[PDB]
Amino acid sequence: TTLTLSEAAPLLKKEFREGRLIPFLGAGFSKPLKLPDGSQLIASLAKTLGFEPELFDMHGRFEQLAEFFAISAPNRLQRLVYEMSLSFDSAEAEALREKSPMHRALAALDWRTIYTTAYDKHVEGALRDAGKQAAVLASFADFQGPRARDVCEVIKFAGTLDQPDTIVLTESSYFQRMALDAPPDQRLRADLLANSFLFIGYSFSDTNIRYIWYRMNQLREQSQLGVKHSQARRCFFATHGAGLVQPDILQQWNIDVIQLDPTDKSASVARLLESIA
Amino acid sequence: TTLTLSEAAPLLKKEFREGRLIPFLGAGFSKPLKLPDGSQLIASLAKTLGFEPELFDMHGRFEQLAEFFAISAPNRLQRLVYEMSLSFDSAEAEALREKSPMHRALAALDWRTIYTTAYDKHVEGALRDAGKQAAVLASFADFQGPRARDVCEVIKFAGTLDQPDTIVLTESSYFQRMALDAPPDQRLRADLLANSFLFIGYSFSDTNIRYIWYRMNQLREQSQLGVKHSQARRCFFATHGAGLVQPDILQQWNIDVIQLDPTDKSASVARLLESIA
Amino acid sequence: TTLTLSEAAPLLKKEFREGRLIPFLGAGFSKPLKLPDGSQLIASLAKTLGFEPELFDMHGRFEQLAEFFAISAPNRLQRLVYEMSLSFDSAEAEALREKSPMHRALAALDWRTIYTTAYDKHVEGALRDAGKQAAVLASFADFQGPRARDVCEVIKFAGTLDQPDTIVLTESSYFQRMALDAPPDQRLRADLLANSFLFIGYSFSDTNIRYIWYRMNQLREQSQLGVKHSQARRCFFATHGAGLVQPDILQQWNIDVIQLDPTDKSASVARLLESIA
Amino acid sequence: TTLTLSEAAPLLKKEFREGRLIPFLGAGFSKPLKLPDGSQLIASLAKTLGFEPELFDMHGRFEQLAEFFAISAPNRLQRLVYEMSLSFDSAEAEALREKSPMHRALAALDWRTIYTTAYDKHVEGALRDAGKQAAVLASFADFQGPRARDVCEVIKFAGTLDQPDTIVLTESSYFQRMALDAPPDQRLRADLLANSFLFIGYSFSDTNIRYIWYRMNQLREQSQLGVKHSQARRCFFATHGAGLVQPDILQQWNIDVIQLDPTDKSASVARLLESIA
Amino acid sequence: APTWFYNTTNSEKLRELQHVLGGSAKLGYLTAKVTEILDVDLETVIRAKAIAAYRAVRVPVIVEHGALCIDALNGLPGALVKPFWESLDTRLCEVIPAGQRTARARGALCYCDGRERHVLIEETEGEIAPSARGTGGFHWDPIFIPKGQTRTFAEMSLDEKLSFSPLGRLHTRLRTELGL
Amino acid sequence: APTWFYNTTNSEKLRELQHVLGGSAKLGYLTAKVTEILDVDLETVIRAKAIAAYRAVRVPVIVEHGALCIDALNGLPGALVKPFWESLDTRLCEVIPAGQRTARARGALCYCDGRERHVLIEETEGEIAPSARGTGGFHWDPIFIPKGQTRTFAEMSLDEKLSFSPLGRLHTRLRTELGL
Ligand SMILES: NC(=O)c1ccc[n+]([C@@H]2O[C@H](COP(=O)([O-])OP(=O)(O)OC[C@H]3O[C@@H](n4cnc5c(N)ncnc54)[C@H](O)[C@@H]3O)[C@@H](O)[C@H]2O)c1
Numbered sequence A, B, C, D: 001t002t003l004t005l006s007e008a009a010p011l012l013k014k015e016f017r018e019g020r021l022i023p024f025l026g027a028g029f030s031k032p033l034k035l036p037d038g039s040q041l042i043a044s045l046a047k048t049l050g051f052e053p054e055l056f057d058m059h060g061r062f063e064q065l066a067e068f069f070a071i072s073a074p075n076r077l078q079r080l081v082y083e084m085s086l087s088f089d090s091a092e093a094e095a096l097r098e099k100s101p102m103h104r105a106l107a108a109l110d111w112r113t114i115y116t117t118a119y120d121k122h123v124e125g126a127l128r129d130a131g132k133q134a135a136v137l138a139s140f141a142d143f144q145g146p147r148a149r150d151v152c153e154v155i156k157f158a159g160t161l162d163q164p165d166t167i168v169l170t171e172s173s174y175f176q177r178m179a180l181d182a183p184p185d186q187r188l189r190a191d192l193l194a195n196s197f198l199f200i201g202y203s204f205s206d207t208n209i210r211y212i213w214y215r216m217n218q219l220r221e222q223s224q225l226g227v228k229h230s231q232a233r234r235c236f237f238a239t240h241g242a243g244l245v246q247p248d249i250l251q252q253w254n255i256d257v258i259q260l261d262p263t264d265k266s267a268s269v270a271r272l273l274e275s276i277a
Numbered sequence E, F: 001a002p003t004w005f006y007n008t009t010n011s012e013k014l015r016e017l018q019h020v021l022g023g024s025a026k027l028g029y030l031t032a033k034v035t036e037i038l039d040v041d042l043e044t045v046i047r048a049k050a051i052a053a054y055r056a057v058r059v060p061v062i063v064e065h066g067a068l069c070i071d072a073l074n075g076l077p078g079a080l081v082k083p084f085w086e087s088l089d090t091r092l093c094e095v096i097p098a099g100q101r102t103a104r105a106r107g108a109l110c111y112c113d114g115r116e117r118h119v120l121i122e123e124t125e126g127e128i129a130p131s132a133r134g135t136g137g138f139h140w141d142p143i144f145i146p147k148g149q150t151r152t153f154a155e156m157s158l159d160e161k162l163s164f165s166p167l168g169r170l171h172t173r174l175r176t177e178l179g180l
């Protein structure tokens, strides 16, 4: 009911040599860089607001606790972006990034489009370390702006720290993205029409991602394909700790789960990216 | 930062005598009828699937565990509706409903529209007990069908057990309601343009409700009213156990919190409905 | 011209110890549970439509009056199924079912297949009361689904209330079953090839049952057996109130009539089921 | 909800001048000839069997009481056909047939196909009285046999008295016609594909007729025509005494009811047939 | 309406705290059952008990937990006194050697308003009785004699027991810090 | 890749279970730290420990918890043996009277695949030593002598200790029920 690493490796080679595989990277892809995930940000937001980190986490979801932080005082969200910039894109986080085996194995492949939901320059920065060049596309002016003819376009689906208006962190920013009208939303839905995705380091907890794959399956069911042909194009979801309910919800949406070895989380991902090559 | 019962009582009399107050009832309004809430359904779904109820609750949200139940076997969702009808609308639940002080105090007021998110006939059934007559509107055929000129219209926002196609319980049904195209969705958004709502027994955990009050705030901010006039029309949120984060999120959306006495949850609501009269 | 209880008792022991006797239960088997038969449903359908119950019964047969009810308004048939579930499978109908002598005497025998034409869980529910386990088979997904190695299979020939698509009540549903293509129709015609049936609480008024035993006689007459061998395998029809015409029509179809005592209808059936043991 | 005589008269002129109207005549078309209907046959079958006519009618339907008559003694059905030939096609019934205004008005129109379910030569015999010639088609040898280039074909749907093997009167004969394999059954279903029918003197009590118009509606619903185009081709059902349930069942099957004046049943039909001319 | 809620399932703790803080109209009462963690330190157990009771009742809550550290058992039971009195009822006077009967009766309140937990700890020196004497009171009161006094907590009335017990110094600190 | 993961923070339990179940390629090892609930019943504590460790690591997990029920203390510590050996190190031989030194060494495995928890309990009769003797082993092994034997768990080697200890009968039951 769940693919292993050796079973999913020839399925990822076929989609990559056709140029129809696109990585979708999450917050967990920057964990060997000693960066906070969605839980240690809330531990840092509770320290500023005067909460205890265990008591503050019981007052709502991740989207709702950041909305409470941004309206506690004026210019409180701007300060967070400044602090995050100092800690996510620091010089010691760049030094851990050349010697990271995942970021070397990601940049060794010749991708054309990479989607990320992280606030750091460590995905396109891994491409600059391997001699390649990337193109960060986060806002409307980036898509309209000039780029080289053949460059891996890194689509910042959540925003970038150098453009603080594009960051979706609070609940009102996620509700603004429910209309699927943003330029990262329009680019994702057109690439999902024709390409397989590889989810690495991302867990389907945001309802803005789960709603896009819902309405792609709707176009699939109304097109009245057979049992054989509607199950042909799959997506892949590499996760060390997938439960029992969530892999069966995603079988509806043509998303296969790749079970990685949870003992060393960094080396299990690196062996997946080297098996595509 | 939170209204009490005596403070919010003259604010509810003014909106009621103008005919601009509409109750929004949740699952907690049927708790003195000894009915399961959203937690004891999951304890019953885990018993059928072979899970332990504490282990099954850690694999996702309420929307996602019901989606996992409905796809475990064919005709598994239909059986649940049949079982729910035997336990929610039973004869012993009707007998506890005439002697319930909340259902007597609700039907004593001359309402015109009541919104509910519960799967039981105990809100309109309380109106039949007081000699009044109600009109259940859940599907498109109910809105098109005939009704008395002046009858309290009970809008089943989540569906009714006698029309099992209207029930939104699984995650795919909540994503179908995100487009705000259903007849309960279109009727709610037009009544929110001109009326105050009174939330009783409902906790803002569903993202389909929180997204409607978000977009209402959009129409409000783009209309460029002042500080005084954009804060004039309020909504009221009676809750025994509101935390510290959630009342401040709802101040953005013109929703005031009424703190009820948590010692006796049944009598605190009944004193609120008698203070409107 | 009609068997009595003592005459038919050794004929039923021989077919039961060979495992070639199958009960066919009707609506009259649930009459000690204080449930409506086919006449008190029409008295309840006339109250909803605004008819008098004596005037409504003269406008057509039972199949035709339910077809008129289902097309009077949208979602009118789904309301009936919900109401039927509240009254047929209620808790007070289950409490009358353990102390019923017919349901105790039915579950005391070790059956393998039971056919029923009633919409209630009181035939398989009698088997759960005696410690045994049953398997309700009503739709195509039930026959395909998993069951245990040896479990009495209860074939809902008319449908079940927890699967409202399987209920045949209106005239268009009986005409859909004339093609004998439904999974209860295909299972019945193959069991009739090799087994004796015992009709309890059912009166041959539906033309879908009388047409199956007609075609069985065709296979029998075209096979050109003798007078002795074509009359060897009989079926049994226990009825308190059989007339003068109907027992002679069924002698064509190898159906024998067992005259039960009409003074106490509940105890006469219970002495028949205890005489098989 | 029911057409009158003046409303349905231009609708019958349009289908007749296109040659797409076919009369369907019943037992009631021979009532001014002083012939028994389905109730006075049962009064005559009860006299032979030794029953009282009121007690014999309570032991089953018309199909079932004739099945009981045919198996009471050997050669009992062949005696009835001989008796019916002496009384239906007698010389005094022919003398009432030239002076009958319905049979004159039927033969004045230039029909091409007439379906009848009666056992008498008074429909084709009315055509011989007007100088026209007819062709009785009842068995397989009649369809294979020679006819003239253009002659109104009278299809005896129930059989004829001069071919006693074609008569369907008993219940086993109606069950033999359920397969829709007889040459009157195959000819009717192909003419129903392209023509409007006019039911005169027939009441939809036989389940072999109601099952044919059921399956025609199937071909109609699976072809996925619109609301406008699936309701274009109608059938017409002239009846003095239609109730309240039966006209609404037939609206499903594109059958319109023409209410005739019940004071003089003979003259109301004759004004309908003269309004087609 | 109250603003602080004292959560306990022990009905003998409830009538003690209503004897002194009963007149305060700002204090309500709840009875949610929580599960304590396994640790002998009183500060650790009472602090994890308040977050587990705020999670249950979702209002500003006050919880209470005790300790009976004994010198002959190197501080055991500590905050593990609830399953000792269940197991060793009055044999607890006999498992301890005569001559080194000294012990401490500790007690802690912790109030959690939903964003911070504050712990108030008082403490009473004493010694374990040679045998269980006394009828009043409840769990382990017939075995504990405070320092200077000759009688147990069970041998004293409710006004006299609260002039020695840790709760009698925790009323005044809880009333002052919460404004009850 | 493994399918079952044995979670422990105690590095002496890890080299015991790798001595016997180490050759199984289907068993991995994790070191997440969980917090036990306060109860003397071993069945209650090991069952609430497995759900607290599945919540941490989110893979099919196997946890382990012990008990040292003593007759002189009416079953104390029970599953509370972790803070006794911290407090009473070898004074635990002296707080118990001579003449009624009998005790039970209990031990329980609980594996949770994410939808069901199954508990395997073994048990060894014994008696508390008059003084702590022996060098090998770890916590409370110098004080426990099994029935029939004269030596402690600390005085025996790892192969000899597992022919008496509860884990030596729990290897075979865990291997059979999980197919390791
Ligand atoms: N600048 C950043 O990197 C950053 C940090 C915190 C939050 N955020 C934003 O807030 C959102 C919430 O973050 P989240 O972490 O809670 O959810 P997430 O879905 O983005 O990350 C969780 C996933 O990371 C995976 N993961 C954890 N450790 C890993 C490892 N060592 N190697 C590979 N994968 C690993 C988990 O298995 C899990 O599937 C994020 O999606 C992001 O938009 C960004």
Ligand SMILES: NC(=O)c1ccc[n+]([C@@H]2O[C@H](COP(=O)([O-])OP(=O)(O)OC[C@H]3O[C@@H](n4cnc5c(N)ncnc54)[C@H](O)[C@@H]3O)[C@@H](O)[C@H]2O)c1
Residues within 6 Å of the ligand: B026, B027, B028, B029, B030, B031, B032, B035, B036, B037, B038, B039, B041, B062, B088, B117, B118, B119, B120, B158, B200, B201, B202, B203, B204, B205, B239, B240, B241, B265, B266, B269
């Ligand atoms: N037929 C039903 O009544 C029923 C039962 C379970 C679930 N559901 C559906 O699933 C959803 C989830 O249910 P849920 O209960 O978890 O969410 P909910 O928001 O509808 O109910 C929670 C609210 O009930 C309130 N409440 C609890 N007890 C109360 C009492 N005695 N008096 C007044 N209010 C009380 C809580 O304070 C809380 O604000 C529901 O919204 C519903 O659509 C319906």
Ligand SMILES: NC(=O)c1ccc[n+]([C@@H]2O[C@H](COP(=O)([O-])OP(=O)(O)OC[C@H]3O[C@@H](n4cnc5c(N)ncnc54)[C@H](O)[C@@H]3O)[C@@H](O)[C@H]2O)c1
Residues within 6 Å of the ligand: C026, C027, C028, C029, C030, C031, C032, C035, C036, C037, C038, C039, C041, C062, C088, C117, C118, C119, C120, C158, C200, C201, C202, C203, C204, C205, C239, C240, C241, C265, C266, C269
């Ligand atoms: N849930 C239900 O039980 C239920 C109720 C009403 C209708 N229905 C459905 O509608 C159909 C209507 O058919 P119907 O009920 O008119 O005729 P039926 O053939 O189903 O039942 C009539 C038979 O019941 C027998 N009977 C009456 N009282 C009895 C008793 N006390 N003990 C034993 N037998 C007794 C009669 O002798 C008679 O032979 C039913 O066949 C059924 O499919 C089901």
Ligand SMILES: NC(=O)c1ccc[n+]([C@@H]2O[C@H](COP(=O)([O-])OP(=O)(O)OC[C@H]3O[C@@H](n4cnc5c(N)ncnc54)[C@H](O)[C@@H]3O)[C@@H](O)[C@H]2O)c1
Residues within 6 Å of the ligand: D026, D027, D028, D029, D030, D031, D032, D035, D036, D037, D038, D039, D041, D062, D088, D117, D118, D119, D120, D158, D200, D201, D202, D203, D204, D205, D239, D240, D241, D265, D266, D269
């Ligand atoms: N040789 C015959 O004519 C004859 C006689 C009796 C029975 N049968 C056969 O047995 C079947 C049952 O006969 P049935 O009469 O009960 O059913 P039927 O449907 O054939 O006739 C009933 C119809 O006759 C109509 N009718 C009655 N009087 C009429 C009149 N004066 N003018 C016009 N229409 C009139 C009724 O309104 C009613 O719609 C018949 O269909 C037939 O096959 C044939």
Ligand SMILES: O=c1nc[nH]c2c1ncn2[C@H]1C[C@H](O)[C@@H](COP(=O)(O)OP(=O)(O)OP(=O)(O)O)O1
Residues within 6 Å of the ligand: E007, E008, E009, E010, E013, E032, E033, E034, E064, E065, E066, E081, E082, E085, E137, E138, E139, E140, E141, E153, E165
């Ligand atoms: O002053 C006291 N005088 C005598 N006995 C006392 C005292 N104070 C606590 N005790 C007893 C009661 C309980 O048996 C144990 C505390 O354990 P503890 O968990 O707090 O008790 P509990 O579970 O029954 O109630 P609660 O829900 O408030 O935690 O020591």
Ligand SMILES: O=c1nc[nH]c2c1ncn2[C@H]1C[C@H](O)[C@@H](COP(=O)(O)OP(=O)(O)OP(=O)(O)O)O1
Residues within 6 Å of the ligand: F007, F008, F009, F010, F013, F032, F033, F034, F064, F065, F066, F081, F082, F085, F137, F138, F139, F140, F141, F153, F165
């Ligand atoms: O066979 C044994 N022989 C000697 N000592 C033992 C044994 N078995 C457990 N012990 C000790 C170790 C620990 O001090 C206590 C168990 O408590 P326990 O909570 O399970 O230990 P732990 O917290 O250090 O590790 P873990 O993360 O697996 O729970 O008793």
Ligand SMILES: [Zn+2]
Residues within 6 Å of the ligand: E034, E036, E082
């Ligand atoms: Zn406690």
Ligand SMILES: [Zn+2]
Residues within 6 Å of the ligand: F034, F036, F082
């Ligand atoms: Zn531990």
